[PDB]
Amino acid sequence: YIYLGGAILAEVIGTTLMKFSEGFTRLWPSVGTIICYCASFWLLAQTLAYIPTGIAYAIWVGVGIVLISLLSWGFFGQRLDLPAIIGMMLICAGVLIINLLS
Amino acid sequence: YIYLGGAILAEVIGTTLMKFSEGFTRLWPSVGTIICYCASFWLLAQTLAYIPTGIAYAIWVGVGIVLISLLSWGFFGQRLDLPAIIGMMLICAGVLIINLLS
Ligand SMILES: Fc1ccc([P+](c2ccc(F)cc2)(c2ccc(F)cc2)c2ccc(F)cc2)cc1
C-alpha cells in the first residue's frame, strides 16, 4: 500500500495506540510505540524520496488534522468547543489559507 | 516549560545535522543524528506528561506550517500579500490563545 497514505495512518494510529489506559489493554506490546516510530520514520523517508517534499508535508498535515479530529469526535466522543480547540481552529484555518496559495 | 519547543527543535536540529553531514570522510557519525531523533521522541514523552496530545500537536502544526513554508521557499522572497498575512496572523492568534490557557 502507498507510502504517503501509510505515513498519514502511522501517526493517526500511533497516537491512538499511545492513548490506551493505565489499566490492561488487549494486544498492546510495551515496545509498540518504539516500533511505531521506527515504522513511521521509514515510511516518511520513502514518502519524501518519491513525492515532492513540500507537497507531501502539506498533504500529510492536511489529511491528518481532519482524520484525527473526525475520528476523535466521532468514535471517542470528544468535545470540539473546549478552550484549546477554539485556538486550534484559527491555526487550522490559517494553515488552509497558506496551503491554498501553495 | 521548554519541552514542546525542545521536541520540535530536536527534529529541526536532527534535520540540520542530516543535511550538513553529506559525504563519509566526515568525523560525525550517523548514530549522533539518530540520538537527536531519539531525543525528539523522548522530549515529546516529557511534553505529554502534563500536556494533552492534541494541544501538543496543534502547536507543533503551527510551527510545522512555517517549516513547510521555509522548505517551500528556500531563500526568503518579497514581502507577504494580504491573505497570507491574515493566514499567518490566524496561526499567531491560535498560539496566543493556547499559551494563555491556565
Ligand atoms: F518533513 C517532515 C515531515 C514530518 C515529520 P514528523 C512525522 C512524520 C511521519 C509520521 F508518520 C509521524 C511523524 C517527525 C517529528 C519528530 C521526529 F523526530 C521525526 C519525525 C512530525 C510530527 C508531528 C508534527 F506535528 C509534524 C511533523 C518530520 C519531517
Curated annotation (Swiss-Prot), chains A, B:
Keyword field contains Ribonucleoprotein: no
Residues under site feature: Required for proper coupling between the substrate transport and the proton gradient: Y1
Impact noted for substituting Y57 to C/F: Still binds substrate, with lower affinity. Resistance to toxicants is abolished
Membrane topology: Multi-pass membrane protein
Predominant cellular place of this UniProt entry's protein: membrane
Site features described as Involved in substrate binding, chain residue numbers: Y37, Y57, W60
Feature type site, description Essential for translocation and for substrate and proton binding: E11
Membrane spanning residue stretches: 1-18, 31-49, 55-77, 84-101
GO molecular function (one): transmembrane transporter activity
Entry GO CC: EmrE multidrug transporter complex; membrane; plasma membrane
Activity profile over pH: Optimum pH is 8-8.5. Transport activity occurs from pH 7.5 to 9.
UniProt keyword terms in alphabetical order: Antiport, Cell inner membrane, Cell membrane, Membrane, Transmembrane, Transmembrane helix, Transport
Subunit architecture: Homodimer. Forms an antiparallel dimeric structure. Also forms dimers of homodimers.
Cited function: Multidrug efflux protein that confers resistance to a wide range of toxic compounds, including ethidium, methyl viologen, acriflavine, tetraphenylphosphonium (TPP(+)), benzalkonium, propidium, dequalinium and the aminoglycoside antibiotics streptomycin and tobramycin. Can also transport the osmoprotectants betaine and choline. The drug efflux is coupled to an influx of protons. Can couple antiport of a drug to either one or two protons, performing both electrogenic and electroneutral transport of a single substrate. Simultaneously binds and cotransports proton and drug.
Misc: Mutants designed to insert with biased topology are functional regardless of the topology.
Family: Belongs to the drug/metabolite transporter (DMT) superfamily. Small multidrug resistance (SMR) (TC 2.A.7.1) family.
Listed name of the protein: Multidrug transporter EmrE
